[PDB]
Design a protein around this ligand. Structure first.
Ligand code: HEM
Ligand code: HEM
Ligand SMILES: [K+]
Ligand SMILES: [K+]
Lengths: 249, 249
């Protein structure tokens, strides 16, 4: 974002109240990982070539929920609706992104700044913009770099989002958690990658590509050695991801 | 407190990191109610008259943990110890109060301000200063007002802390949660009291005493009528409680 919109005092209070409601609900239900995936899938369809897609509430749409990459997100939508209903003033766009920021916070992650003002767009973006787990470097730069407009550093920091969660065979075809503490947000994702594959944990082709790249590799090593650096770079990347196509840029 | 102490930039940085660590651990373990009871029992021992007791890390001591009213708090002290070891420069006084503030935040409660600077004291206070659940009005004002120095408003807002958590027969004799949502911080404690006793939910004599007092009753209806009012008052009472005898007042 560059020039953030001025929201009404009631909209602002709505946001402050929804944040508190989301914290308790997400904490109690232990669904932080799925909610972060929802926020990421909502924001990651932004394509700078056409200036379409992005964090604009379209994911709740049937057309978009039908995308292969969105398998299982229907439960995230259904989960949050009860809370969303108490806030008709807030847009789905802002709401899902606020949930994502809360998901990181509740699990012990850095506090990502949030700015309201996103509007809900009527039509969902076409399928195929989100990353393929079976691909590598080339693909990652095309998706995050060419389409989204993010930096190489951002790619690595955001991949760290896998520090929480796990894959489910019926949703993506892969299975298992990336770390030993799938509900704690830390830099352990990078250490697992550096220590090679092991039975109980999951490592996707896309995660491994970070190990063989000349730019990615030294960042994976820094993050594994210093959590504070990982957190600051993650916050920076998540903030930009969430405002893709919003408030000027 | 009125005049906050200057702490090093490293100390403040440690506090912020500790806050993030406490969030993830407390949410994952679902022990927020227990953590708040620990913080409250740590601060509620202050005697303004003698200027003894209060939030100064003494609850980790065996002699104080042996106080019958602190039954089960030994478990909370142990649960947090591994996190405390990651932050050796932070005092236990600050640590426990910070943990109490976090417990409120993750359950959906208001954001209570925190100011570091409490020093740990070698001598825990004498037994018997904490409120007795079998008594009423006179005793509550005797404890909160005379000893601690809090107002009648503070007494009712603070009792609202029962919105999360439950009694355990092997800790106090009583059993059951006060609300049908013990991990969600809201004003349900007050509405439960106003609507009488129900099967399953708990109401202590000290809780019921709020209904038969000229000053307490109106406050109960005030908070039962408006959650925003409750949140503002609680945050204020909690801030005062956590700083009893610290930074002057
Ligand atoms: C870089 C390329 C990425 C690819 C190809 C990828 C791929 C995947 C796959 C295959 C799943 C689905 C697991 C399932 O079957 O449920 C998954 C889960 C997840 N991913 Fe990613 N991911 C990527 C980037 C990210 C980013 C940028 C974030 C956000 C910071 C993120 C956050 C998550 C989370 C939290 C989960 C776990 C969800 C749960 O526990 O249910 N991913 N990812
Ligand atoms: C007004 C006088 C109060 C009395 C006499 C009282 C009494 C009690 C008793 C007997 C229990 C049951 C303990 C157990 O068996 O686990 C309890 C639990 C609890 N109380 Fe209070 N309470 C009072 C004030 C407060 C205050 C000021 C707070 C905090 C702001 C608070 C927070 C809690 C919490 C969170 C629990 C649940 C503990 C758990 O779930 O493990 N109480 N209280
Ligand atoms: K982890
Ligand atoms: K409650």
């Amino acid at each position: 974002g560059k020039s953030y919109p001025t929201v009404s005092p009631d909209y602002q209070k709505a946001i402050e109240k929804a944040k508190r409601k989301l914290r308790g609900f997400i904490a109690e239900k232990k669904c932080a990982p799925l909610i972060l995936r929802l926020a990421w899938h909502s924001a990651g369809t932004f394509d700078s070539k056409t200036k379409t897609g992005g964090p604009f509430g379209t994911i709740k749409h049937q057309a978009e929920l039908a995308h292969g990459a969105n398998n299982g997100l229907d439960i995230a939508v259904r989960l949050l609706e009860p809370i969303k209903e108490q806030f008709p003033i807030v847009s789905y766009a802002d709401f899902y992104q606020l949930a994502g920021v809360v998901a990181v916070e509740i699990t012990g992650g850095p506090e990502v700044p949030f700015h309201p003002g996103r509007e809900d767009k009527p039509e969902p973006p076409p399928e195929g913009r989100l990353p393929d787990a079976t691909k590598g470097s080339d693909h990652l730069r095309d998706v995050f770099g060419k389409a989204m407009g993010l930096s190489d550093q951002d790619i690595v920091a955001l991949s760290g989002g896998h520090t929480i969660g796990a894959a489910h065979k019926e949703r993506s075809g892969f299975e298992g958690p990336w770390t030993s503490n799938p509900l704690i947000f830390d830099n352990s994702y990078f250490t697992e990658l550096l220590t090679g594959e092991k039975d109980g944990l999951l490592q996707l082709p896309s995660d491994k590509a970070l190990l063989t790249d000349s730019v990615f590799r030294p960042l994976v090593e820094k993050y594994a050695a210093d959590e504070d650096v990982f957190f600051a770079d993650y916050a920076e990347a998540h903030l930009k991801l969430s405002e893709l196509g919003f408030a000027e840029a």
